[PDB]
Amino acid sequence: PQITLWQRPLVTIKIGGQLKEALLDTGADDTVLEEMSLPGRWKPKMIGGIGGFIKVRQYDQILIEICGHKAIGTVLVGPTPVNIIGRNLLTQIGCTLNF
Amino acid sequence: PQITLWQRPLVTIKIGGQLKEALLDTGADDTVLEEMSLPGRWKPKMIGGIGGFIKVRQYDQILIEICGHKAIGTVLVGPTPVNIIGRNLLTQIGCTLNF
Numbered sequence: 544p545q546i547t548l549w550q551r552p553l554v555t556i557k558i559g560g561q562l563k564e565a566l567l568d569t570g571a572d573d574t575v576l577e578e579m580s581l582p583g584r585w586k587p588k589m590i591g592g593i594g595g596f597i598k599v600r601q602y603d604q605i606l607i608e609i610c611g612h613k614a615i616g617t618v619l620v621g622p623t624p625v626n627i628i629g630r631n632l633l634t635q636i637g638c639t640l641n642f
Numbered sequence: 643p644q645i646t647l648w649q650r651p652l653v654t655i656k657i658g659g660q661l662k663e664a665l666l667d668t669g670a671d672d673t674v675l676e677e678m679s680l681p682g683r684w685k686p687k688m689i690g691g692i693g694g695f696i697k698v699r700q701y702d703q704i705l706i707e708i709c710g711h712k713a714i715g716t717v718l719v720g721p722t723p724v725n726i727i728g729r730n731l732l733t734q735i736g737c738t739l740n741f
């Protein structure tokens with residue numbers, strides 16, 4: 544699909560058997576989700592944004608369906624104000640910027 | 643141009659007679675730049691991100707040339723770790739997301 548930016552580029556995703564809406568974020572190296580429940584193990588990690596740094600849980604090889612496209616990658620979970628789909632996953636679903 | 647996301651989508655921009663590199667950021671409602679010198683008046687404003695919030699100067703009707711395309715909009719200036727080109731400007735240069 545082609546998406547214009549007059550509004551937030553929100554997409555529906557399916558992860559850990561649950562449905563959520565997430566922002567397609569070209570300015571995000573990583574994918575960050577708000578507190579939700581995920582199976583398996585993780586490693587502590589910290590990441591930075593505007594405003595400072597937040598502490599997250601890191602989960603590798605996680606399946607995610609973004610607007611019907613599957614992808615497996617690292618997903619971070621924590622105190623983010625909004626669910627974010629980062630470049631690590633955008634590349635897998637063939638997402639591109641155009642102008 | 644079309645742009646893949648294997649790398650951070652950086653572009654050269656011309657603003658306030660100066661050259662900068664900036665990130666095309668679909669996850670940004672606003673355009674925010676590192677401390678720089680701009681002419682005119684502004685106002686104090688606050689904006690939020692992943693680690694919290696930063697205070698910035700707001701400038702309306704600022705001319706920016708992004709990868710050779712011209713746009714006039716609000717540009718914020720302050721303590722951001724990286725120059726960000728937000729949707730308020732992305733829409734003006736006809737930038738889309740595709741997959």
Ligand SMILES: COC(=O)N[C@H](C(=O)N[C@@H](Cc1ccccc1)[C@@H](O)CN(Cc1ccc(-c2ccccn2)cc1)NC(=O)[C@@H](NC(=O)OC)C(C)(C)C)C(C)(C)C
Nearest residue numbers: 570571572573591592593624667669670671672690691692
């Ligand atoms: C290498 O660092 C990163 O990749 N930081 C990524 C990040 O923060 N990206 C920012 C741009 C950025 C990159 C590198 C260093 C610092 C900042 C954006 O791509 C995505 N983003 C993600 C984001 C979106 C909403 C919010 C938010 C926060 C508090 C309250 C409401 N919304 C926070 C972060 N947006 C914002 O912070 C924007 N906020 C915004 O549009 O607010 C509506 C700004 C910019 C205009 C301030 C993540 C932490 C998400 C991975």
